């Protein structure tokens, strides 16, 4: 009664290949869908021998579930997908892309523009070690990340999930892997896939490729630039990963000079499979094949096609797995997809499974739920926070004293503005919801509550969210912190064709540092118009989407740490300038990538 697939001393290829030889058609294409929660039962998983689940943003058990709710409810599928003749686990994903996001509770990091900023990949490869702790805190044992899009147009909504406009720091970035997943052994062949076992997840680098190139910044559009480009801009922090055995990738949407990424069988088989040698599994995006065609989902039958014949693995179908089973299955039934293209997706997507360990440990571990949320992974998000932060003036003429560092004894201060007390937005897109949300979404400490935990006890703190100049002039403050920018967006959403703040942004501005002297923080995934709000400012700090610890902001405002980050992109004068970035022949920005002003700790 042995049975060699089963056996855990054996090798990952041969478990693969003894597994393989036994599957049927069913059973293969089974391993090649993956459907949401949301229409997942325990008949649907084992009836079409369902290979994967996933969470979309804001796909939850309950809104403010328990890291032990989450596990349950994996381990309900996975009990579904075990008792399949063959006792194939499933693997389920999630987008655990600034922390476990979608979760209740669970520490949220800076978005991956701030990160850049920090120019320290060692900070993130420990992001992701934390990461992968929070994502099997709740039972899963999938990252969808990291996102190494080079963004080259700050006009794009998903700006703010590329590390930098420049690939070197994008490629120094990739150590999220390593952390995710564990390091890759020292004879590590390239292109292979790896995670270390039950307390690390699987990653995923995406989207493959050119998604930060396209024109205007216009999501998931045609990226416009010859191959020497691709491969200089786009392409290199791909073959990084290859190199710390990332164990997936998921295509993007956009195209390449007219070509649509899901239907490029150059790219997705003769490049990254033939070429730099990936042996892990290739994911589609959420209905990305359906968009092969405009409109979108008008010829299913040529999307199940042109994408599997382009190399794709596995789809997340996430909804209609009915309808992608039938017809892939009529495809290879009627000889328009080969046996070995079936074979070699499911394949690769057993060699990651088999070699994560999914097998041995298809089930969650309780004793891992007291990790969501832990203070160790709270301070490592704080030091992040404060390490993005981007000083960008800090005294209006160079004879003035420097407002920053600010003393934590003053009689009365104010703290002010849209984003001062505002979790969800200092936290940006997702975050609890796929598009972020407003207000206090989960567990973290806002502006205004940092600045009260950090100030002298005989410090009285005012807040006022919009106040007017006369109240300013007449409150008797020391000085004023005021926070305002962009609220919450994602992907297509946050495509901005002029990039000013929303009102009233810029007027609480003026009215708070009219009156009094005022360090402006302003919370965005991106540069955005700034000159006025530096005109009015005696301080200014560039601070991303900071995440859930706020008091990585006040580290560096009341001077326990100097500022130290170091803007990741090109600020511009103009968005008439825009596409700019470092190195182009008109490069005329207001701060150049690389400027940041910098203080001594006091
Ligand atoms: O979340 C999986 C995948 O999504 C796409 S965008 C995706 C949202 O989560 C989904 O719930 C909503 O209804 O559709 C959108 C796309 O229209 C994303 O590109 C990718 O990074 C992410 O992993
Ligand atoms: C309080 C303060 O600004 N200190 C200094 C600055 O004047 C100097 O350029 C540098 C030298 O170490 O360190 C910082
Ligand atoms: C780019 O966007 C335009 C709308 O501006 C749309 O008509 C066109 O289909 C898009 N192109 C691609 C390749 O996605
Ligand atoms: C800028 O574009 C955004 C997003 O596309 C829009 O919501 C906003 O109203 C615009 N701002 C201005 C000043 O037109």
């Known amino acids: 009664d042995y049975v060699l697939y089963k056996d855990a001393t054996k090798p990952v290829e041969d478990r693969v290949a003894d597994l393989l030889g036994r599957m049927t058609l069913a059973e293969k294409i089974g391993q090649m869908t993956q459907i949401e929660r949301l229409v997942a039962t325990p008949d649907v998983l084992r009836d079409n021998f369902i290979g994967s689940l996933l969470s979309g943003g804001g796909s939850v ?64 490869k420990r992001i992701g070690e934390a990461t992968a702790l929070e994502v099997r805190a709740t039972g899963i044992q999938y990252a969808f990340a990291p996102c190494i899009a080079v963004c080259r147009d700050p006009r794009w909504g998903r700006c703010y999930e590329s590390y930098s406009e420049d690939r070197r720091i994008v490629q120094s970035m990739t150590e999220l892997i390593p952390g995710l997943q564990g390091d890759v052994p020292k004879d590590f062949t390239s292109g292979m896939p790896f995670v270390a076992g039950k307390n690390k997840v699987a990653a995923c680098a995406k ?13 998931e559009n045609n990226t416009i630039i010859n191959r020497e480009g691709l491969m200089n801009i786009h392409m290199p922090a791909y073959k990084n990963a290859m190199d710390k055995g990332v164990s997936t990738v ?21 490049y990254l499979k033939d070429t730099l040698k990936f042996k892990g599994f290739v994911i589609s995006d959420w209905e990305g094949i359906d968009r092969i065609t405009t409109p979108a989902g008008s010829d299913y039958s040529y999307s199940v096609k042109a994408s599997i014949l382009a190399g794709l693995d596995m789809i997340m179908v996430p909804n209609k797995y009915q309808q992608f089973i039938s017809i892939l299955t009529g495809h290879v039934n009627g000889g328009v997809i080969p046996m070995s293209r079936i074979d070699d997706a499911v394949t690769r997507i057993l060699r990651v499974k088999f070699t994560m360990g999914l097998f041995e440990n298809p089930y969650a571990d309780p004793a891992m739920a007291e990790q969501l949320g832990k203070q160790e992974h709270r301070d490592l998000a704080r030091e992040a926070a404060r390490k993005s932060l981007v000083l960008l003036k800090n005294g209006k003429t160079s004879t003035d004293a420097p407002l920053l560092p600010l003393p934590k004894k003053a009689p009365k201060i104010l703290v ?26 989960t567990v973290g400490t806002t ?94 700090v560039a601070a991303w989407l900071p995440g859930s610890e706020g008091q990585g902001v006040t580290d560096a405002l009341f001077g326990d740490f100097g500022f130290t980050g170091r803007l990741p992109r090109t600020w511009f004068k103009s968005v008439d300038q825009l596409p700019m970035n470092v190195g182009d022949a008109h490069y005329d920005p207001l701060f150049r990538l690389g400027y940041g002003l910098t203080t001594n700790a006091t």
Not at 253 to 264: D, E, I, L, P, R
Request: net charge negative; charged share 15%; hydrophobic share 40%.
């Open 61 to 124: 058990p309950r809104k403010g579930a328990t890291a032990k709710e989450w596990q349950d409810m994996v381990d309900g599928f996975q009990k579904a997908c075990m008792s399949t003749r063959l006792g194939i686990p499933m693997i389920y994903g999630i987008d655990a892309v600034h922390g476990q996001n979608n979760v209740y509770g669970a520490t949220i990091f800076p978005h991956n523009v701030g990160l850049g900023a920090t120019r320290d990949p060692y900070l993130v």
């Open 416 to 441: 002010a503005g849209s984003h001062a007390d505002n979790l969800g937005y200092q936290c940006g897109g997702w975050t609890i919801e796929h598009q972020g949300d407003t207000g206090r979404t």
């Open 207 to 219: 989207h493959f490729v050119g998604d930060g190139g396209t024109v205007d910044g216009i999501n």
């Open 447 to 540: 502006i205004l509550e940092a600045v009260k935990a950090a100030v002298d006890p005989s410090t009285v703190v005012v807040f006022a969210e919009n106040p007017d100049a006369e109240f300013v002039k007449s409150g008797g403050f020391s000085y004023a912190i005021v926070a305002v920018g962009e609220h919450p967006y994602t992907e297509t959403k946050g495509d901005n064709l002029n990039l000013t703040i929303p009102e009233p942004g810029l007027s609480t501005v003026q009215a708070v540092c009219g009156g009094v002297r005022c360090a402006t923080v302003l919370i965005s995934g991106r540069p955005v118009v700034v000159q006025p709000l530096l005109a009015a400012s005696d301080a200014l």
């Open 250 to 270: 998921m295509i993007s949407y956009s195209s390449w000079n007219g070509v649509k990424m899901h239907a490029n069988q150059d790219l997705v088989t003769g």
